DNA sequence: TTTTTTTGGTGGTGGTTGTTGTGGTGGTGGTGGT
């Protein structure tokens, strides 16, 4: 049901142009990108379109992965020549760069000039091809009135992308969307945001946002919550978890790394994104933070169903997807776990095991011949035999393709490197974090019809604008600590947008 | 104040980094593995 404007951008891409297209929050940029990818893939081949964004959550929104994950450059910090050498070792990433025909990059506002220039070097060098990006077709999408790249604060609204040599030679074409969809119900709200987008906040606009400080309805819809800093986010996530009914399950990380200063180690540990102490409950909302396979990536959203050991989960999964599931099969595995292990492997202590929440057996429930749910009492027995085995969270993850894949999530390992690649710090922990609340950075690209926003710690230009334009309706938005002095837009972006009509 | 991540050969400034190689479609490495 794409608009006249959206379809012409898709059709322009068919003609082979290297395009950047843009528009205010909620103009339908990502919804259009999703559809565009199908036709680029039909032109180039299923495996030959790189779909990428600046953050994990924004990449998942269009079925892709982070530009960093795609390129194979790690953090991509060093000289272009060093990154290229890292890339050319890894067979997956070198072949990817040689074979792809198109590179899709969403939320481009968060990509700094150095990365584009280095990426240009990499594509030119790998493909033996002096075209702007080795000839890869470029589709760039985002809004530079939103967040700039993440940096600290020497003198760094880091030169944005439009200042990169790679950009000026590569980007052939720009397209601007104008119609705001996200907030379409509320024209006064849309006008307030777009002027807020440009850093032009008047008194009357300020009055209306300060009016939205009233609390949200206590209704069963759990709100999204947005904060500037990870510390704010963790407090909001842990609060919501404590309101959930249920026994807490504690997962303490295993940390290491061959550095003598314990404090220095902890500084490096903070940026691993998986918590030291992961607390989960049945019903907890979680986010995947590691790239495990093709459709389970950083940004995948899920809900904890229960906690089971691998033997129990094999039975749970098979009971799911059952032709009719004669309860005899479950019984064989119950009294003879040696047969469960073989069955499981054919396809490949002092703490009481709490029984499974009855909600996890609801899928079979939606005539006493078939209402004999002995399997529920059979599944509970098999689970009880897991006393003294590790019980992992079963999470229903939802991918960008609308699939609802159930995964019993095992611990993974993280490591960082040096100027070269010696590991400084390493951790083993589940690749999960609570995700009712989101940082404003990772929220960028999301649509949040019920959201609380606390602007108390906003610092970068455009951050306040990003947070409020996630909302759909004013009735579903609360804003705390709005301050107009913290919303001024970057003049370089105002100027750049002047060559656009 | 915030984001970004890692198998194999089209490296060798390292095995303390290989259950990540119980490898070999690599050689400007050798405290690793056969
Ligand atoms: N043509 C359209 N018709 C109806 N709704 C749309 C259309 N385009 C976008 N939307 C809605 O607008 C919201 C934001 O769109 P999105 O593609 O995320 O914009 P952006 O990526 O620019 O923020 C989505 O929830 C989507 O449902
Ligand atoms: F610019 Al957006 F969601 F991608 F507001
Ligand atoms: K090696
Ligand atoms: K060797
Ligand atoms: K080797
Ligand atoms: Mg988008």
Residue numbers in the entry: 236 to 583, 607 to 624, 631 to 765
Direct quotes from the study:
Guanine-rich DNAs can fold into noncanonical DNA structures called G-quadruplexes (G4s). The highly stable G4s can impede many cellular processes such as replication, transcription, and translation, and the failure to resolve G4s results in genome instability. Pif1 helicase binds preferentially to G4 DNA and plays multiple roles in maintaining genome stability, but the mechanism by which Pif1 unfolds G4s is poorly understood. Pif1 helicase plays multiple roles in maintaining genome stability in both the nucleus and mitochondria.
We then went on to crystallize ScPif1 in complex with ADP·AlF4− and T7-AT11 containing a 5′ T7 ssDNA loading site (designated as ScPif1-G4) and determined its structure at a resolution of 3.5 Å. The asymmetric unit of the crystal structure contains two essentially identical ScPif1-G4 complexes. The AT11 portion of the DNA substrate is well ordered in the electron density map and adopts a G4 conformation very similar to that of AT11 alone, indicating that ScPif1 did not disrupt the G4 structure. In the structure of ScPif1-G4, the conformation of ScPif1 is very similar to that of ScPif1 bound to a ssDNA29 except for the 2B domain, which rotates 9° upon G4 binding relative to ssDNA bound ScPif1. ScPif1 recognizes G4 mainly through the wedge region containing α5 and α6 with additional interactions contributed by the β15-β16 loop in the 2B domain. The prominent feature of the ScPif1-G4 interactions is that R324 interacts with G12 in the 5′ most G-tetrad (G9.G12.G15.G19) through cation-π interaction and with T8 (the first nucleotide preceding the 5′ most G-tetrad) through van der Waals contacts, which in turn stacks against G9. Additional interactions involve R326 which contacts the phosphate backbone between G9 and G10 and the base of T11, and R323, which interacts with the phosphate backbone connecting T11 and G12, and L329 and R330, which interact with the base of T11 through van der Waals contacts. Compared with the wedge region, the β15-β16 loop in the 2B domain interacts solely with the peripheral region of the G4 and has no contact with the G-tetrad. In the structure of ScPif1-G4, the Pif1 signature motif not only contacts the regions involved in ssDNA binding but also interacts with the two α-helices in the wedge region predominantly through extensive hydrophobic contacts, thereby stabilizing the wedge region. Our ScPif1-G4 structure showed that the structurally conserved wedge region contacts the ssDNA/G4 junction with R324 playing a key role in mediating the interaction of ScPif1 with G4.
